[model samples]
Target chain A: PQRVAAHITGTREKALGRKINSWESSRSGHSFLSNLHLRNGELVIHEKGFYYIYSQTYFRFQEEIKENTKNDKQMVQYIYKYTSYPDPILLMKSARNSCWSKDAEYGLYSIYQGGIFELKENDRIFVSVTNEHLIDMDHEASFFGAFLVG
Target chain B: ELCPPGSHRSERPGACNRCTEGVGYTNASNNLFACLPCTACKSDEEERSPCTTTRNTACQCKPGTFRNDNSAEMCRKCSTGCMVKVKDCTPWSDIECV
Candidate 1:
């Protein structure tokens, strides 16, 4: 499980126009790659205003044809998982058509569609994907990313 | 023994003394017979409930405005910015619109 930094940018304001505040540029651009850890058995990915969970896996197989053998076959599959709590917004993939793997046990999959969600105090979120391979691959793994709201 | 003159007993065992024509009451028990009038409110004087032995009198806002919170001193102005001069505003000396 490798770690990578994620960026965040946004503003804060009072609901009734009473008070307003902004984040500093240096702090705003800070990444979460260095603050990855496990808390109480759950993967904790520390982002700007909340924590996140991320994982990735990849699978590949190849076939060898003798001198007069027919055609060779190959296949690949990827799985990813992400879960965020407290924050309303949840994102599974960076973009559509991006290379990623989803975790079957956690039910997370690679997809291009990502949207913002407003969550109350307690909310549960899950996603997953699966791919078939024509040939047996030597290596296989999955990836995932999860985030929370302030 | 019999009670002194000018007195009548209420539902309870004690008696109220009768009143002396125009002066204080003169019932069996002077303390229990005298009745106090209700507090006065200029506008809703007729519609408001009068004071009684069990309950104290209170002023209420007239027809248009309502008294939601407990015993309001003055009725709040109606919505839509409509400020019709229905009753003379005397008690609400400090109340005003911008």
Candidate 2:
């Protein structure tokens, strides 16, 4: 059997829910899929084996000072594995608190992580964040991928 | 040449050997000598899937217990009392009621 590998870039298109954000698997620089499937913002698995999973997200915000202007105090990035279980499994998470200063007008933050794990066929992998609007969809800035080891 | 799954070699010219069963393994092609160890389920957790030469053990909260995330703490017991059950109990989350 052939090994599986996929490198997907972020998409500017908005996600329906805050839980999972979609990606661009083709027609983007350094983005491609091999012996794998991309469906509904998830990297679907077809072959059961070990895989090294990874994801990255960039968050930025710039706003003018104003009275009673509200801001998100915490920024979180979550990598989930959706399997046969009832709920999606939380594979990894990165939380940033107080990313922006009260006096500052702009702020930037990025979260990234990777790990190797045994996976089963039909399992799905995807990324999510606390604030989707703050994410920068630049192809190079935010990306996700996985590759078979054996 | 790369070693096959569940086997490893110390040197490029050395022969590949099988990893000890139930002790360690490699599910992908590699040339390393050290095989990855299998996962051991916690006291409050149960083995959802067993470890094998091509896969690691999968753990989940025991029955009647739940966990919201992959925290270090043990699985929590489900809450009691509910006028009307809203959602069924799951390994990852507690039961919901109205």
Candidate 3:
């Protein structure tokens, strides 16, 4: 068996008159925080709820070894955005399975594990996810993504 | 109110009947006389049949979202959301976020 490493990074934009935070985790306990600033011409107020923007990238390494062959290695990446809030449930809710892969040749996968959710103020939001295992290939490697919105 | 698809009004007001093989509707108050079709929740603007009278009239899941249990009443959030078809809204069983 071989050991592999994976990582992901991205940014989040808050809806107009709204703010949000990012949650990061490591082998140690969870610890991380960041605030989002509103951008000009970047906010869209459609129904009664505000909207925010977020970007996430996930990276993982995969390796497989056979009885008579050397190990093969490959890296996987996933980038996405939090297009809606209040329904952070909808952020990653509409991803096309094909968005991860076109041929299904790489064994890429994703799931909505679970997250932290809280409601604050009249127009603020707070949401986060941890232990988001997004990919599993050949049972050799896995990667996750997490975040918060307010 | 009009009955949802798979259901019919028994020549009475505020009374909806369930379809034999598809979605059904419960009695309610509305002026629409004809039954509405049972459409899967594919987008924000698409029309859908309500689950029942007690329950909300719409049976739609958010994009990337799917119900764990098949019943229309207790639709649980999908762990990984939905990947393939929106109408069926099937979650990736083995690959969860955690």
Q: Where is model 3 more than 4 Å wrong at Cα?
A: A1-22, A25-49, A59-131, A134-150, B1-98
TM-score of 1: 0.19
Q: Considering TM-score, which of the candidate structures 1 and 2 is the better prediction for this target?
A: 2
Encode model 1's per-residue lDDT on A99-128: one tens digit a residue: 223211112222223344433222333323
True-vs-predicted CA distance for residue B12, candidate 1, Å: 78
lDDT of 2 by residue, A62-150 (tens): 54465686554577887788889877787888888643446554566777889887889999988878878767775667889999985
Q: lDDT per residue, candidate 3, A68-92, as tens digits?
A: 7433323222222334353322233
Candidate 1, chain B, TM-score (2 decimals): 0.33
Please compute DockQ, using alpha carbons, for every candidate against the native two-chain complex: 0.00, 0.01, 0.01
Mark the regions of model 1 whose C-alpha exceeds 4 Å error after superposition: A1-53, A63-90, A94-119, A132-149, B1-98
| Per-residue C-alpha lDDT of model 3 across residues B1-98, encoded as one tens digit per residue | 35554455655777755543323232454334333322333222223553443233454544443444443322233444444533333432223331
Weakest 10 consecutive residues of candidate 3 chain A by summed lDDT: A1-10
Count of steric clashes across candidates, in order? 46, 3, 14
